[PDB]
Amino acid sequence: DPLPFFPPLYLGGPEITTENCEREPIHIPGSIQPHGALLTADGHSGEVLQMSLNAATFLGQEPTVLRGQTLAALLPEQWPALQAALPPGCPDALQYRATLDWPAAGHLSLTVHRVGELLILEFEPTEPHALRNAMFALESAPNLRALAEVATQTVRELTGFDRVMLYKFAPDATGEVIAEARREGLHAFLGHRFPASDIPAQARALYTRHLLRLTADTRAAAVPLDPVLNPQTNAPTPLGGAVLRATSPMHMQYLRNMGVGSSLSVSVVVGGQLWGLIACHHQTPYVLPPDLRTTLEYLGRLLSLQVQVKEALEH
Amino acid sequence: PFFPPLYLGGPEITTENCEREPIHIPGSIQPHGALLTADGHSGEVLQMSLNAATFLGQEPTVLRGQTLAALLPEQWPALQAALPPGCPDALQYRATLDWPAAGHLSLTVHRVGELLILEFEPTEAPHALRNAMFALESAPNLRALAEVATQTVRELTGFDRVMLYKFAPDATGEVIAEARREGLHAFLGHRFPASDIPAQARALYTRHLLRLTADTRAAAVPLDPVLNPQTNAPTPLGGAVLRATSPMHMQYLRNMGVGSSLSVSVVVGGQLWGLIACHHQTPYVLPPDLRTTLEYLGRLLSLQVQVKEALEH
Ligand SMILES: *C/C=C1/C(=C/c2[nH]c(/C=C3[NH+]=C(/C=C4\NC(=O)C(C=C)=C4C)C(C)=C\3CCC(=O)O)c(CCC(=O)O)c2C)NC(=O)[C@H]1C
Ligand SMILES: *C/C=C1/C(=C/c2[nH]c(/C=C3[NH+]=C(/C=C4\NC(=O)C(C=C)=C4C)C(C)=C\3CCC(=O)O)c(CCC(=O)O)c2C)NC(=O)[C@H]1C
């Protein structure tokens, strides 16, 4: 039965059990994963409102100094570019990316998107023809099976992940591993099926709009935003569009129990519906840098197109 | 059918026989790169472009005996695996060579039956592609998508004019969006007859998705031999971007005052929906890595055109 979200934990909401999976408000956890930092800022003035508690250690500045400046002063070269790329009223799915040379922290990748009157800024550390070669190989795959196999093998070669699977949704939202590339010694998931509640309905809706999510370390504690609520609204900060957003504790426990230290998946979206997932696993924690993740994002789109094409060749 | 090419004493093309120019087998290439053909098994260099000596820095005869194994040691096994016998002519493999004579070359290979076609071009060596991808996806409708696409391509390439050229059901073309330098004629809104892009050219554009003329006044460079030794027949060059552009079309571009021309096919439901079409007033060799960006954009636009057309119908 579909039911509306509970309030999050920090607003006195209940703790999540196998009874109430579909009601955890996974988009507003009030916290991020510790391998990057996040700031929120007023979309018109550029006043800095919220920051992750670890921000001082990524950005090399005291909180009170950060919060006491506008983005115009903090990001003089990027602030006008942000404002042109992310105009008021734009969708929350639109992202702008730049690379910064920050004194204390080396090269940072900056990813920005806009939710209403809020700008959300994510900072992460950042670092030949493999993509072009893959694009052509995907297109020349003769059928859906060969496409799925080429796609899994390519992603594994690009990333070094222990396991890469193509997980396909059935009409009842149960899913099935239909191809996989895996490290020697791992047991096969190929052909196994899993119940629809393994990925609940409010996750599947979110995964149709925001096409890549990840858990870099399934044992890492989440880092709170400070303050936790958006001071504009005294309400929760929407983090559905932020890759840094904390994974749900239910899902992290599901993964630890499987022996997984790192997770990533790309949505494959066909005709406006979530067709399936490029889901990857690593046994140890593992951070895939932003520019490599971009390659996977591009492959997500290519695969969406090629899945349509291969399936049309099939009636 | 097709007329024989000129160099096999076929008729010269006119506006009476537009549909029968054998544009895939011109026997020549554009001079900003070099092309070798080679045997699929032996790696034996069978044809070369008369200009190969320039790019490769090799005494002419040296090449036309040697083997790819010898000539490209690191690459030759990769090719063997990347382009297995029986693969499609559409499948391409690329690498960057740090080659003694020329700082860096791009190498592009595909296979047509028993022949490997190798293309060499100068090359080199950020977020504009990722930023463009998200911009295309958040365009609210087909019109805005067209506008974003043309603007994005112009910004990435510096081309004087970028258009989105959409085919009607009878192959009548319409310019539905345009991004252009100040002080050019506007082709926005204009329609053009199907015969400007003739049927045999449209078919080839459905399979091989990027072509160009780098300089509309440059002479083609012959293949030597012109005929493939294997077959004593013309080498199919339609999957080669270095393939000499039909003089009928280079004349159409000179009469427009265009010095440089590139286009990317937008393919939807197995059919040619449209073209990203680019003009430059002067000669312009777009480097391979930037062309790759446009090739990606072509696929992304193909996806988004279907998405956007579905939310009208
Ligand atoms: C009471 C709730 C439960 C629950 C919740 C849940 N699941 C997700 C998202 C995912 N679940 C996945 C499950 C699988 N991983 C596999 O490898 C296989 C099969 C071999 C399955 C079935 C996957 C892949 C995802 C997607 C994300 C990822 O790549 O890890 C969420 C949302 C998490 C978030 O975005 O923060 C939630 C809340 N799963 C259950 O089994 C029950 C107990
Ligand atoms: C007797 C045949 C003629 C003919 C042949 C022909 N046309 C092409 C390819 C193209 N024609 C194009 C025409 C236009 N470009 C524009 O900007 C506009 C409108 C403003 C039109 C109508 C285009 C865009 C192409 C695609 C190639 C490109 O990107 O430049 C070919 C094929 C050439 C080749 O690939 O080798 C041929 C043989 N064109 C005519 O107009 C008649 C006289």
Swiss-Prot record, chain A:
Keyword Membrane: no
Domain GAF intervals: 143-307
PTM annotation, UniProt: Contains one covalently linked tetrapyrrole chromophore. Lacks the cysteine conserved in plant phytochromes (at the position of Met-250) that binds chromophore. An engineered sequence used for X-ray crystallography forms a thioether link to biliverdin through Cys-21. The natural sequence can bind phycocyanobilin and phytochromobilin in vitro, but the identity of the natural chromophore is unknown.
Binding site for a tetrapyrrole: 21
GO molecular function: ATP binding; identical protein binding; phosphorelay response regulator activity; phosphorelay sensor kinase activity; photoreceptor activity; protein kinase activator activity
Domain PAS, chain residue ranges per copy: 23-91
Keywords, alphabetical: ATP-binding, Chromophore, Kinase, Nucleotide-binding, Phosphoprotein, Photoreceptor protein, Receptor, Sensory transduction, Transferase
Keyword Transferase: yes
Single GO BP term: regulation of DNA-templated transcription
Reported function: Photoreceptor which exists in two forms that are reversibly interconvertible by light: the R form that absorbs maximally in the red region of the spectrum and the FR form that absorbs maximally in the far-red region. Also has a slight blue shift for the far-red maximum. Could also absorb green light. May participate in regulating pigment synthesis like the carotenoid deinoxanthin which could protect the bacterium from intense visible light.
Family statement drawn from the similarity comment of this UniProt entry: In the N-terminal section; belongs to the phytochrome family.
Protein name, UniProt field: Bacteriophytochrome
Organism: Deinococcus radiodurans (strain ATCC 13939 / DSM 20539 / JCM 16871 / CCUG 27074 / LMG 4051 / NBRC 15346 / NCIMB 9279 / VKM B-1422 / R1)
UniProtKB/Swiss-Prot annotation, chain B:
Effect on the protein of changing residue 248 to A: Binds PCB (in vitro), but difference spectrum is altered
Presence of keyword ATP-binding: yes
Claim: Cell membrane is one of the keywords in the record: no
Location of the GAF domain: 141-305
Listed GO biological process terms: detection of visible light; osmosensory signaling via phosphorelay pathway; regulation of DNA-templated transcription
Protein modification: Contains one covalently linked tetrapyrrole chromophore. Lacks the cysteine conserved in plant phytochromes (at the position of Met-248) that binds chromophore. An engineered sequence used for X-ray crystallography forms a thioether link to biliverdin through Cys-18. The natural sequence can bind phycocyanobilin and phytochromobilin in vitro, but the identity of the natural chromophore is unknown.
Family: In the N-terminal section; belongs to the phytochrome family.
Function: Photoreceptor which exists in two forms that are reversibly interconvertible by light: the R form that absorbs maximally in the red region of the spectrum and the FR form that absorbs maximally in the far-red region. Also has a slight blue shift for the far-red maximum. Could also absorb green light. May participate in regulating pigment synthesis like the carotenoid deinoxanthin which could protect the bacterium from intense visible light.
Name this polypeptide is given: Bacteriophytochrome
Organism whose genome encodes this protein: Deinococcus radiodurans (strain ATCC 13939 / DSM 20539 / JCM 16871 / CCUG 27074 / LMG 4051 / NBRC 15346 / NCIMB 9279 / VKM B-1422 / R1)
Lineage: Bacteria, Thermotogati, Deinococcota, Deinococci, Deinococcales
Gene behind the chain: bphP
